[PDB]
């Protein structure tokens, strides 16, 4: 006789974990792109330093 509580606790536990899963995955892919562009900029600024 506490099904509204069981569904609410299930909603909280399956909403927080989905939000933090999305946050971790989104942070991983965004800083993967930032790393892959950061390395290209470090090679290009080295080439520009030797050119200058």
């Amino acid at each position: 006789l506490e099904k509204r509580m069981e569904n609410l606790n299930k909603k909280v536990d399956d909403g927080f974990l989905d939000i933090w899963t999305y946050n971790a995955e989104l942070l991983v892919l965004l800083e993967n792109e930032r790393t892959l562009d950061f390395h290209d900029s470090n090679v290009k600024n080295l080439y520009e330093k030797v050119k200058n």
């Binding site: 006789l1 506490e2 099904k3 509204r4 569904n7």
Partner: protein
């Protein structure tokens, strides 16, 4: 953008309550007589303000838990748990009230039986039902709380009566409480409605010496993966969408909505 109209889901018509509540559907309200047939649905469509619920006044115990249990129910089989003629040889089952008028005459619930006296005596009651439907069975009853001791002695022939309803997972004893009450729908008495969900292979036992509104028809409930209760004022037409809101239906593959 939506249709603006209520739709069937995947070729399955919704259970439209119309003027009914969840309570008036399960109790078998005489205005809610179209819903009392063996059927399946995709969702339950209900009006935001519907008045045909419990016609006799009283407290529906754990109504919102019954709504949460019935949100995941896809179909029922309405079967006579206790027959009105066979199971009651020593009580007068022909009990109607003025709180539930059906075509301008007095009637009572189509799922419940108001037991009264027979030949000036109310005998002891012990009726057992064993679940052989292999599903969850919604058992529904009521306990009558009169307004004065004169109506209690008139109806049930004793001052002190009780109702005992014991399952394996249910154990509750009920005591009528005679008191002076405000009139709701012309009645100063109350029928308090209770419910339990029988397990497959479980036994319900109904014991009473008075004030029992016994079960007549029970609901053998079938669960489903996708179902719910939608509160909408939208009219239902012929429609075969896959997404359904209260405000209409959606036919697109777009990932988001703001309806």
């Amino acid at each position: 953008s939506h249709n603006g109209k209520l739709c069937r889901l995947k070729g399955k018509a919704p259970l439209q309550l119309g003027n009914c509540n969840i309570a008036g559907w399960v109790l078998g309200n005489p205005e809610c007589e179209s819903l009392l047939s063996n059927r399946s649905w995709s969702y339950i469509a209900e009006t935001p303000n519907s008045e045909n619920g419990t016609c006799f006044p009283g407290d529906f115990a754990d109504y919102e838990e019954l709504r949460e249990q019935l949100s995941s129910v896809s179909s029922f089989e309405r079967f006579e748990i206790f027959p009105k003629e066979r199971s009651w040889p020593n009580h007068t089952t022909r009990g109607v009230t003025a709180a539930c008028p059906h075509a301008m005459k007095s009637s009572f619930y189509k799922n419940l039986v108001w037991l009264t006296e027979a030949n000036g005596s109310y005998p002891n009651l012990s009726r057992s039902y064993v679940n052989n439907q292999e599903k969850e069975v919604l058992v529904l009853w009521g306990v009558h709380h009169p307004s004065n001791i004169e109506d209690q002695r008139t109806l049930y022939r004793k001052d002190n009566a009780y109702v005992s309803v014991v399952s394996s997972n249910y154990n509750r004893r009920f005591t009528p409480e005679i008191a002076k009450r405000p009139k709701v729908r012309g009645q100063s008495g109350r029928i308090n409605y209770y419910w339990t969900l029988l397990e497959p292979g479980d036994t319900i036992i109904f014991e009473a010496t008075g004030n029992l509104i016994a079960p007549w028809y029970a609901f053998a409930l079938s669960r489903g993966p996708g179902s719910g209760i939608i509160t909408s004022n939208a009219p239902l037409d012929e429609c075969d969408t896959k997404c359904q809101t209260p405000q209409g239906a959606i036919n697109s593959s777009l990932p988001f909505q703001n309806i």
